Design an enzyme around this catalytic site. Structure first.
Site, mmCIF file in Angstrom:
data_model
loop_
_atom_site.group_PDB
_atom_site.id
_atom_site.type_symbol
_atom_site.label_atom_id
_atom_site.label_comp_id
_atom_site.label_asym_id
_atom_site.label_seq_id
_atom_site.Cartn_x
_atom_site.Cartn_y
_atom_site.Cartn_z
ATOM 1 N N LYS A 4 10.910 -0.428 -0.356
ATOM 2 C CA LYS A 4 12.033 0.084 1.067
ATOM 3 C C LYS A 4 12.238 -1.010 1.682
ATOM 4 O O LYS A 4 13.931 -0.555 1.716
ATOM 5 C CB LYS A 4 10.494 0.861 2.161
ATOM 6 N N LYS A 21 6.482 -9.284 -3.722
ATOM 7 C CA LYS A 21 6.959 -8.773 -2.439
ATOM 8 C C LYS A 21 8.006 -9.103 -1.607
ATOM 9 O O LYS A 21 7.863 -9.683 -1.327
ATOM 10 C CB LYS A 21 5.732 -7.606 -1.587
ATOM 11 C CG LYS A 21 6.545 -6.711 -1.145
ATOM 12 C CD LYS A 21 5.608 -6.317 0.034
ATOM 13 C CE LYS A 21 6.068 -4.179 0.687
ATOM 14 N NZ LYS A 21 4.824 -3.674 1.404
ATOM 15 N N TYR A 61 -2.315 -8.750 -7.934
ATOM 16 C CA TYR A 61 -1.681 -7.980 -9.117
ATOM 17 C C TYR A 61 -1.898 -7.018 -9.798
ATOM 18 O O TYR A 61 -3.621 -7.547 -10.086
ATOM 19 C CB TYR A 61 -0.865 -8.926 -10.570
ATOM 20 C CG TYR A 61 -0.630 -8.246 -11.819
ATOM 21 C CD1 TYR A 61 0.315 -7.412 -11.793
ATOM 22 C CD2 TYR A 61 -1.354 -8.385 -12.771
ATOM 23 C CE1 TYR A 61 0.384 -6.264 -13.251
ATOM 24 C CE2 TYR A 61 -0.423 -7.694 -14.162
ATOM 25 C CZ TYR A 61 0.086 -7.004 -14.166
ATOM 26 O OH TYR A 61 0.522 -6.404 -15.732
ATOM 27 N N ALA A 62 -1.839 -5.741 -9.373
ATOM 28 C CA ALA A 62 -2.986 -4.365 -9.879
ATOM 29 C C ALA A 62 -2.445 -3.958 -11.437
ATOM 30 O O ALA A 62 -1.434 -3.821 -11.700
ATOM 31 C CB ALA A 62 -3.148 -3.171 -9.438
ATOM 32 N N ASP A 88 -0.892 4.266 5.619
ATOM 33 C CA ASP A 88 0.174 4.426 4.645
ATOM 34 C C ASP A 88 -0.585 4.783 4.091
ATOM 35 O O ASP A 88 0.005 4.418 2.151
ATOM 36 C CB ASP A 88 1.155 3.942 4.787
ATOM 37 C CG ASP A 88 2.598 4.579 4.157
ATOM 38 O OD1 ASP A 88 2.671 5.685 4.098
ATOM 39 O OD2 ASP A 88 3.174 3.766 3.779
ATOM 40 N N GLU A 115 0.919 6.728 -4.580
ATOM 41 C CA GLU A 115 1.587 5.240 -4.644
ATOM 42 C C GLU A 115 1.887 4.396 -3.942
ATOM 43 O O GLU A 115 1.863 2.946 -4.451
ATOM 44 C CB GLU A 115 3.149 5.434 -4.558
ATOM 45 C CG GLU A 115 3.601 5.663 -2.835
ATOM 46 C CD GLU A 115 4.970 6.142 -2.945
ATOM 47 O OE1 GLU A 115 5.680 6.992 -3.254
ATOM 48 O OE2 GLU A 115 5.848 6.015 -1.560
ATOM 49 N N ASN A 116 0.699 3.724 -2.684
ATOM 50 C CA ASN A 116 -0.040 2.454 -1.914
ATOM 51 C C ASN A 116 -1.507 2.193 -2.927
ATOM 52 O O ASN A 116 -1.942 1.249 -1.976
ATOM 53 C CB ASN A 116 0.112 2.259 -0.541
ATOM 54 C CG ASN A 116 1.408 2.623 -0.195
ATOM 55 O OD1 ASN A 116 2.175 3.229 0.887
ATOM 56 N ND2 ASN A 116 2.722 2.036 -1.292
ATOM 57 N N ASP A 158 -0.113 -1.888 -0.076
ATOM 58 C CA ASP A 158 0.486 -1.779 1.202
ATOM 59 C C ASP A 158 0.535 -1.522 2.830
ATOM 60 O O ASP A 158 -0.012 -0.504 3.167
ATOM 61 C CB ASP A 158 1.703 -0.379 0.433
ATOM 62 C CG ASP A 158 2.956 0.370 1.246
ATOM 63 O OD1 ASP A 158 3.528 -1.341 2.100
ATOM 64 O OD2 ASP A 158 3.720 0.571 1.305
HETATM 65 N N1 LIG Z 1 0.637 -5.764 -7.000
HETATM 66 C C1 LIG Z 1 0.802 -5.200 -7.010
HETATM 67 N N2 LIG Z 1 0.845 -4.288 -8.732
HETATM 68 C C2 LIG Z 1 1.224 -3.651 -9.052
HETATM 69 N N3 LIG Z 1 2.113 -3.107 -8.576
HETATM 70 C C3 LIG Z 1 2.549 -3.075 -7.607
HETATM 71 C C4 LIG Z 1 1.756 -3.814 -6.988
HETATM 72 N N4 LIG Z 1 2.492 -4.235 -5.196
HETATM 73 C C5 LIG Z 1 3.041 -3.047 -5.632
HETATM 74 N N5 LIG Z 1 3.347 -2.489 -7.111
HETATM 75 C C6 LIG Z 1 4.081 -1.501 -7.226
HETATM 76 O O1 LIG Z 1 5.622 -1.643 -6.392
HETATM 77 C C7 LIG Z 1 5.817 -0.365 -5.419
HETATM 78 C C8 LIG Z 1 5.974 -0.465 -4.002
HETATM 79 O O2 LIG Z 1 5.346 -1.283 -3.506
HETATM 80 P P1 LIG Z 1 4.565 -1.435 -1.965
HETATM 81 O O3 LIG Z 1 4.221 -3.280 -1.484
HETATM 82 O O4 LIG Z 1 3.593 -0.090 -1.761
HETATM 83 O O5 LIG Z 1 5.811 -1.463 -1.160
HETATM 84 P P2 LIG Z 1 6.379 -0.314 0.076
HETATM 85 O O6 LIG Z 1 6.114 -1.396 1.361
HETATM 86 O O7 LIG Z 1 8.246 -0.396 0.040
HETATM 87 O O8 LIG Z 1 6.419 0.639 -0.055
HETATM 88 C C9 LIG Z 1 3.780 0.071 -5.729
HETATM 89 O O9 LIG Z 1 3.964 1.666 -5.259
HETATM 90 C C10 LIG Z 1 3.896 -0.330 -6.726
HETATM 91 O O10 LIG Z 1 4.359 0.744 -7.471
HETATM 92 O O1 LIG Z 2 6.805 -4.583 3.630
HETATM 93 C C1 LIG Z 2 7.274 -3.444 3.835
HETATM 94 O O2 LIG Z 2 8.616 -3.213 2.040
HETATM 95 C C2 LIG Z 2 8.096 -3.042 5.184
HETATM 96 C C3 LIG Z 2 7.395 -3.932 5.934
HETATM 97 C C4 LIG Z 2 7.907 -3.160 7.699
HETATM 98 C C5 LIG Z 2 7.409 -2.486 7.896
HETATM 99 C C6 LIG Z 2 7.503 -1.309 6.793
HETATM 100 C C7 LIG Z 2 7.153 -1.759 5.790
HETATM 101 C C8 LIG Z 2 7.494 -0.514 4.596
HETATM 102 O O3 LIG Z 2 7.553 0.310 3.987
HETATM 103 O O4 LIG Z 2 5.808 -0.851 3.886
HETATM 104 MG MG LIG Z 3 4.786 -0.226 2.336
HETATM 105 MG MG LIG Z 4 4.136 1.644 -0.047
#
Ligand SMILES: Nc1ncnc2c1ncn2[C@@H]1O[C@H](COP(=O)(O)OP(=O)(O)O)[C@@H](O)[C@H]1O
Ligand SMILES: O=C(O)[C@@H]1CCCC[C@H]1C(=O)O
Ligand SMILES: [Mg+2]
Ligand SMILES: [Mg+2]
Ligand SMILES: Cc1c(C(=O)NS(=O)(=O)N(C)C)cc(-c2ccc(Cl)c(Oc3cnccn3)c2)c2cc[nH]c12
Ligand SMILES: [Cl-]
Ligand SMILES: [Cl-]
Length: 258
Positions: free
Chosen positions: A17, A36, A86-87, A130, A134-135, A148
């Site tokens: 995001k 991230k 890393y997953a 959350d 996707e998380n 996440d």
């Molecule tokens: N440790 C990880 N290993 C593999 N893929 C990941 C990992 N972290 C995130 N991702 C990928 O990146 C996407 C965005 O990560 P996420 O931490 O959920 O971000 P956001 O807070 O923006 O939703 C995940 O939904 C997944 O597709």
């Molecule tokens: O890790 C992030 O992208 C953001 C950090 C601040 C709060 C919202 C959060 C998210 O969208 O999961």
């Molecule tokens: Mg998030």
């Molecule tokens: Mg997420």
């Protein structure tokens, strides 16, 4: 301590995001990890810089095999970087997209994995808030990892994408606790078996109404045991939802997991 120069950056792992997640390797140790990356300008515009310190503080102190590790973090002039485990097998989201639905054995296993991770979180008064495919990430053995912690808070809280996994009290903007994750768990169990969440709709408006009313139906292939657990978790009243011990001891879970 850490700096961007300590890491070789690979392909993106997914769009965030507030930036993107990249595959990366720590130069000295050759440790593969997920970085991230969040833009400072975007966080400030959204006024979520505080919630980011929250995600970091909460995740960095969790140690459980079904919870994704946060090894550290750092930032530079324009970005914040979270050093994640890393997953390798991606998201449960992608798996559901290719398989359409999961059988009852895969479903009950994931629900057991989630319930154990959530039991650990709730013991520290941590609310994930959350919990969605996707998380939900997959380890090297295909084990589910809760990820996440972006919207994570300590319970009780009044602190206010789609509404699909949110309970009635979090929508409306009311006070809430650990019971929000039990609702989310029920939405997940339904989606895993059906292929789509129970309140799915074309608009945010229509989804809000269905959650508010607890308006959903099961396709005929959903078993009696599956309908029982889902119906128990999807209570408008958070007090009526079961404890995680009850989810883990539910006959349908014990009969199909793991
Ligand atoms: N440790 C990880 N290993 C593999 N893929 C990941 C990992 N972290 C995130 N991702 C990928 O990146 C996407 C965005 O990560 P996420 O931490 O959920 O971000 P956001 O807070 O923006 O939703 C995940 O939904 C997944 O597709
Ligand atoms: O890790 C992030 O992208 C953001 C950090 C601040 C709060 C919202 C959060 C998210 O969208 O999961
Ligand atoms: Mg998030
Ligand atoms: Mg997420
Ligand atoms: C401007 C700024 C700054 C800022 O101080 N910049 S600075 O030094 O004055 N400088 C432009 C390098 C910091 C953040 C921010 C928010 C949350 C976290 Cl978790 C974070 O990570 C950390 C925090 N401490 C230690 C190690 N990593 C950093 C944010 C978020 C949006 N804008 C910010
Ligand atoms: Cl705050
Ligand atoms: Cl610092």
């Amino acid at each position: 301590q850490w700096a961007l120069e300590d890491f070789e950056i690979g392909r993106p792992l997914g769009k965030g995001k507030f930036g993107n997640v990249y595959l990366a390797r720590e130069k000295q140790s050759k440790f593969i990890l997920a970085l991230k990356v969040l833009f400072k300008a975007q966080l400030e515009k959204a006024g979520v810089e505080h919630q980011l310190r929250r995600e970091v503080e909460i995740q960095s102190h969790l140690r459980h095999p079904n919870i994704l590790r946060l090894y550290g973090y750092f930032h530079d002039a324009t970005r914040v970087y979270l050093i994640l485990e890393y997953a390798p097998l991606g998201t449960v989201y992608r798996e559901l997209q290719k398989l359409s639905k999961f059988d009852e054995q895969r479903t009950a296993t994931y629900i057991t994995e989630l319930a154990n991770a959530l039991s650990y979180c709730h013991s520290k008064r941590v609310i994930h808030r959350d919990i969605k495919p996707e998380n939900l990430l997959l380890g090297s053995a295909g084990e589910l990892k809760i990820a996440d912690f972006g919207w994570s808070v300590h319970a009780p809280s009044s602190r206010r994408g789609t509404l699909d996994y949110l309970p009635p009290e979090m929508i409306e903007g009311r006070m809430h606790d650990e019971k929000v994750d039990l609702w989310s768990l029920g939405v997940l169990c339904y989606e895993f078996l059906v292929g789509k969440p129970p309140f799915e709709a074309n608009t945010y408006q229509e989804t809000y109404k269905r959650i508010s009313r607890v308006e959903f139906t099961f396709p005929d292939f959903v078993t009696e045991g599956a309908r029982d657990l889902i119906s128990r978790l999807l209570k408008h009243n958070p007090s009526q939802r079961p404890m995680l011990r009850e989810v883990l001891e539910h006959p349908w879970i014990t009969a199909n997991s793991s």
